């Protein structure tokens, strides 16, 4: 649970940066 | 989309309140005497 949770938050900031750069 | 995404902003001015106040002056008083003339 903790593993895929931290994976998920990493994925979240990934999506943040990707949507920042369009 | 092509121009990168815009950024929201906010600004508001200072709005004083409207009050209704009414005051009064008065007609100043006066005196009315009567006197006689002495010797």
B15's tokens:
């709005």
The answer to whether the CB of B3 falls within 8 A of the CB of A22 is no
Rounded Cα–Cα distance for residues A6 and A14 (Å): 12
CB of B24 within 8 Å of any CB in chain A?
no
What whole-number distance in Å separates Cα of residue A8 and Cα of residue A1? 10
CA distances from B39 to B17, B25, B36 (A): 69, 44, 10
> What contacts B5, CB < 8 A, 6 or more positions away?
A19, A22
Tell whether A17 is within 8 A of chain B (Cβ). Answer: no
> Does B4 contact chain A (CB < 8 Å)?
yes
Closest residue in B to A22 (Cα) is: B4
Experimental method of this PDB entry: cryo-EM
Q: How many residues are listed for chain B in this entry?
A: 39
For residue A22, the chain B residues in CB contact (below 8 A) are 1, 4-5
Element (DSSP H or E) covering residue A14: helix A2-20
**Resolution of the model in angstroms:** 38.0
C-alpha distances (whole Å) from B35 to each of B30, B32, B39 are: 17, 10, 13
Here the tokens at position B11 are 């600004």
């Amino acid at each position: 649970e903790d593993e895929y949770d931290v994976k998920y938050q990493m994925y979240k900031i990934n999506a943040r940066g990707e949507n920042l750069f369009g | 989309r092509n121009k990168f995404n815009y950024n929201t902003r906010e600004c508001q001015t200072i709005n004083p309140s409207i009050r209704e106040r009414g005051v009064s002056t008065e007609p100043p008083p006066s005196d009315t005497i009567c006197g006689n003339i002495t010797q």
